[PDB]
Design an enzyme around this catalytic site. Structure first.
Site, PDB file in Angstrom:
ATOM      1  N   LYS A   1       8.846  16.379   7.091  1.00 49.24           N
ATOM      2  CA  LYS A   1       9.203  16.218   5.675  1.00 49.24           C
ATOM      3  C   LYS A   1      10.381  17.152   5.349  1.00 49.24           C
ATOM      4  CE  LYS A   1       7.486  16.417   1.000  1.00 49.24           C
ATOM      5  NZ  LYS A   1       6.359  16.454   0.039  1.00 49.24           N
TER       6      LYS A   1
ATOM      7  N   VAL B   1      10.319  11.614   4.691  1.00 46.19           N
ATOM      8  CA  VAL B   1       9.502  11.939   5.879  1.00 46.19           C
ATOM      9  C   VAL B   1      10.035  11.143   7.069  1.00 46.19           C
ATOM     10  CG1 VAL B   1       7.184  12.004   6.845  1.00 46.19           C
ATOM     11  CG2 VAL B   1       7.478  12.465   4.447  1.00 46.19           C
TER      12      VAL B   1
ATOM     13  N   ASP C   1      -3.247  16.638  -6.763  1.00 47.51           N
ATOM     14  CA  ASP C   1      -2.511  15.349  -6.677  1.00 47.51           C
ATOM     15  C   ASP C   1      -3.183  14.414  -5.672  1.00 47.51           C
ATOM     16  OD1 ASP C   1      -0.534  13.474  -7.336  1.00 47.51           O
ATOM     17  OD2 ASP C   1       0.969  14.415  -6.067  1.00 47.51           O
TER      18      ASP C   1
ATOM     19  N   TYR D   1      10.433  12.937  -3.756  1.00 48.06           N
ATOM     20  CA  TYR D   1       9.916  14.110  -2.992  1.00 48.06           C
ATOM     21  C   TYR D   1      10.886  14.530  -1.880  1.00 48.06           C
ATOM     22  CZ  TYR D   1       8.384  10.529   0.390  1.00 48.06           C
ATOM     23  OH  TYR D   1       8.377   9.479   1.263  1.00 48.06           O
ATOM     24  N   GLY D   2      11.795  13.655  -1.466  1.00 48.17           N
ATOM     25  CA  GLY D   2      12.606  13.851  -0.262  1.00 48.17           C
ATOM     26  C   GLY D   2      12.364  12.718   0.711  1.00 48.17           C
TER      27      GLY D   2
ATOM     28  N   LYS E   1      10.839   7.620   1.874  1.00 47.00           N
ATOM     29  CA  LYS E   1      11.939   8.140   1.030  1.00 47.00           C
ATOM     30  C   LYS E   1      11.484   8.007  -0.414  1.00 47.00           C
TER      31      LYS E   1
HETATM   32  C1  LIG Z   1       1.671  12.234   2.102  1.00 48.97           C
HETATM   33  O1  LIG Z   1       2.313  13.457   2.543  1.00 48.97           O
HETATM   34  C2  LIG Z   1       2.743  13.492   3.846  1.00 48.97           C
HETATM   35  C3  LIG Z   1       2.612  12.469   4.791  1.00 48.97           C
HETATM   36  C4  LIG Z   1       3.138  12.578   6.087  1.00 48.97           C
HETATM   37  C5  LIG Z   1       2.910  11.483   7.067  1.00 48.97           C
HETATM   38  C6  LIG Z   1       2.267  11.811   8.254  1.00 48.97           C
HETATM   39  N1  LIG Z   1       2.014  10.843   9.178  1.00 48.97           N
HETATM   40  C7  LIG Z   1       2.418   9.605   8.951  1.00 48.97           C
HETATM   41  C8  LIG Z   1       3.099   9.204   7.830  1.00 48.97           C
HETATM   42  C9  LIG Z   1       3.474   7.751   7.680  1.00 48.97           C
HETATM   43  C10 LIG Z   1       3.938   7.042   8.751  1.00 48.97           C
HETATM   44  C11 LIG Z   1       4.241   5.670   8.586  1.00 48.97           C
HETATM   45  C12 LIG Z   1       4.033   5.060   7.385  1.00 48.97           C
HETATM   46  C13 LIG Z   1       4.367   3.596   7.286  1.00 48.97           C
HETATM   47  C14 LIG Z   1       3.527   2.857   6.218  1.00 48.97           C
HETATM   48  C15 LIG Z   1       3.804   1.355   6.169  1.00 48.97           C
HETATM   49  N2  LIG Z   1       5.174   1.085   6.669  1.00 48.97           N
HETATM   50  C16 LIG Z   1       5.223   0.902   8.140  1.00 48.97           C
HETATM   51  C17 LIG Z   1       6.134   2.104   6.237  1.00 48.97           C
HETATM   52  C18 LIG Z   1       5.843   3.432   6.951  1.00 48.97           C
HETATM   53  C19 LIG Z   1       3.539   5.768   6.295  1.00 48.97           C
HETATM   54  C20 LIG Z   1       3.243   7.103   6.451  1.00 48.97           C
HETATM   55  C21 LIG Z   1       3.363  10.162   6.817  1.00 48.97           C
HETATM   56  C22 LIG Z   1       4.110   9.826   5.552  1.00 48.97           C
HETATM   57  C23 LIG Z   1       3.824  13.745   6.456  1.00 48.97           C
HETATM   58  C24 LIG Z   1       3.977  14.749   5.476  1.00 48.97           C
HETATM   59  O2  LIG Z   1       4.669  15.925   5.743  1.00 48.97           O
HETATM   60  C25 LIG Z   1       5.251  16.149   7.046  1.00 48.97           C
HETATM   61  C26 LIG Z   1       3.495  14.611   4.201  1.00 48.97           C
HETATM   62  O3  LIG Z   1       3.665  15.590   3.229  1.00 48.97           O
HETATM   63  C27 LIG Z   1       2.760  16.683   3.261  1.00 48.97           C
END
Ligand SMILES: COc1cc(-c2cncc(-c3ccc(C4CCN(C)CC4)cc3)c2C)cc(OC)c1OC
Ligand SMILES: COc1cc(-c2cncc(-c3ccc(C4CCN(C)CC4)cc3)c2C)cc(OC)c1OC
Ligand SMILES: COc1cc(-c2cncc(-c3ccc(C4CCN(C)CC4)cc3)c2C)cc(OC)c1OC
Ligand SMILES: COc1cc(-c2cncc(-c3ccc(C4CCN(C)CC4)cc3)c2C)cc(OC)c1OC
Lengths: 292, 281
Positions: free
Chosen positions: A31, A18, A129, A15-16, A12
């Site tokens: 997202k 996920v 970015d 950006y919004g 959160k």
């Molecule tokens: C950067 O950008 C994008 C990312 C993602 C994305 C894809 N897989 C996994 C994740 C993720 C999962 C879990 C954690 C954990 C980290 C430690 N703790 C446990 C809190 C949570 C973090 C990250 C994400 C954020 C999807 C996106 O779009 C659909 C994104 O945007 C393009």
């Protein structure tokens, strides 16, 4: 089968949000963009239409949606899910050996060279970015680059430069000198590749700090943690990078280790104030392929 | 934390062409229209999606947006409300009109087009359609129409040749003036008004459905065919004698002539067309 169950919020921000979701029995990332970032959703959607963007080191696209009833609009990007989270997350409480450190940084270099190099297909793409929160860690120990909402596309074949319409700017901490002093040549595609190289150097530094040598490792810190306030402004970053000509410090223990000595050399060649002097993504990839 | 039912059943193909296909579909028991884009017409999905991402148009005489979907080749779908009566073009082939229905159709189109054209502050940018024609207008069960297809629309692929204004055919259009695009739409509006008016019965007489310039260009006219008729000879659609016995068709002939001036700046605005139509009958 198009249905999706949102299971838990994994992020959160401005950006919004996920979400980890389930779709056709697999984890997916969903997202939901903030209305303030509507121009990023459309740009990312234009980028994922690209024929040959798909790559093991680029976050894999599944779908993009804009939905509306009455006066409200929802903006959705659905990708593959990476349970290990972002490189930023991963470095907080993991140290690396030589093999794991080189695997991570070569994988990022491989993804970035794939973006930067035109295929005659896929246009050349500058990310704008790049940072450790926009890199995800995969279970094979390679990473993939995420977030194409600020990306620039260029075709040498047709002399077309597509800078898109997005007033968003890069993450302040990772902005190149020419972004912070606003002298960057905005109608020059190479300018945007060179901003990516600067940011790559900073990600190299963040990763190298976490590689053990001679029983020593540094704690995770973000770039410029020592010289700017906790939540640095645009002007705070301009002060250190452009006025003070600061670059991240190289820990002296790196000079005892051949791999970290090689990486220190490679990150300094990403950090020249003169953007034309910086290494290309391809050269970085070739250098990391040669390092052990 | 919640289910997102995205499954849309495609039930029947209601249109096929160079643009791709349109399907009647079902989401959650509710009819939707699904436009599946050809590779030829991919830029139309991007343009319309960018417009709706900028301004969520909502108007009774604009086809209602539901969704833009991209699924990894890449499949591009535009999902809108479904109008079972189909296009004005389709409707006019078989159906004749009375005075009330004719006016309700043309005032509803003028209302939609004025809504596109007008900038609203606080609101929406001014929008020109750039492919207004009877195939891009849908008929609703309440007797009003809605304007469809914003895939060529401009905010402040070429238009259908048959409907191009003289300044588009002779390349004199003032491309630096957004008003130029509004005036090109008004020309096309006047041709649509002619198509509809022909189907209005007066004194037991009606014309058969024909497309604009049916009697002076080939079935599939070239750009040059159209330029010679519209620009060089300065022809306009025929107004039949029988219209001048009918007060409504007499007023509509005057209106359509004021959409067809060679000088784009002489043409009526969408807002003035509305005012004129509210004082007919
Ligand atoms: C950067 O950008 C994008 C990312 C993602 C994305 C894809 N897989 C996994 C994740 C993720 C999962 C879990 C954690 C954990 C980290 C430690 N703790 C446990 C809190 C949570 C973090 C990250 C994400 C954020 C999807 C996106 O779009 C659909 C994104 O945007 C393009
Ligand atoms: C895309 O189209 C359709 C969508 C939906 C639909 C399904 N779930 C939830 C929603 C929704 C709920 C609540 C908000 C708001 C409420 C106020 N505030 C708190 C902000 C949030 C927005 C949206 C909708 C609109 C239904 C439809 O038809 C019945 C649609 O049309 C086919
Ligand atoms: C991704 O794709 C498609 C989605 C949908 C759809 C289905 N159920 C529910 C929704 C929904 C709407 C809105 C909210 C709001 C609630 C509160 N607010 C503050 C945050 C979010 C949540 C859920 C949607 C949008 C339909 C589709 O087709 C008609 C989709 O595919 C094009
Ligand atoms: C112009 O453009 C678009 C139009 C539509 C659209 C919306 N409602 C209904 C229709 C339709 C339904 C049914 C028939 C026929 C079938 C055979 N029968 C003998 C008479 C009736 C025709 C037409 C369409 C084509 C959707 C679009 O996108 C989703 C359009 O593109 C923007």
């Amino acid at each position: 089968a198009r249905d999706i169950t949102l299971l838990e919020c994994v992020g959160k921000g401005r950006y919004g949000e996920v979400w980890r979701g389930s779709w056709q029995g697999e984890n997916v990332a969903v997202k939901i963009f903030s209305s303030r970032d509507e121009k990023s959703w459309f740009r990312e959607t234009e980028l994922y239409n690209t024929v040959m963007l798909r790559h093991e080191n680029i976050l894999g696209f599944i779908a993009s949606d804009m939905t509306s009833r009455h006066s409200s609009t929802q903006l959705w990007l659905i990708t593959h899910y990476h349970e290990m989270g972002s490189l930023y997350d991963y470095l907080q409480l993991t140290t690396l050996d030589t093999v794991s450190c080189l695997r991570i940084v070569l994988s990022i270099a491989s993804g970035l060279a794939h973006l930067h190099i035109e295929i005659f297909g896929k246009p050349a793409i500058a990310h704008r970015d790049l940072k450790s929160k926009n890199i995800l860690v995969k279970k094979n120990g390679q990473c993939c680059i995420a977030d194409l909402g600020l990306a620039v596309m260029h075709s040498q074949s047709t002399n077309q430069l597509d800078v898109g319409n997005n007033p968003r700017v890069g993450t302040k901490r990772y902005m190149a000198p020419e972004v912070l002093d606003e002298t960057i040549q905005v109608d020059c595609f190479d300018s945007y590749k060179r901003v990516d190289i600067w940011a790559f150097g900073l990600v190299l530094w963040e990763v190298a700090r976490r590689m053990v040598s001679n029983g020593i490792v540094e704690d995770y810190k973000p770039p410029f943690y020592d010289v700017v306030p906790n939540d640095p402004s645009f002007e705070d970053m301009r002060k250190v990078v452009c006025v003070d000509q600061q670059r991240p410090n190289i820990p002296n223990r790196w000079f005892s280790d051949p791999t970290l000595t090689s990486l220190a050399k490679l990150m300094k060649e990403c950090w020249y104030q003169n953007p034309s002097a910086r290494l290309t993504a391809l050269r970085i990839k070739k250098t990391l392929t040669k390092i052990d």
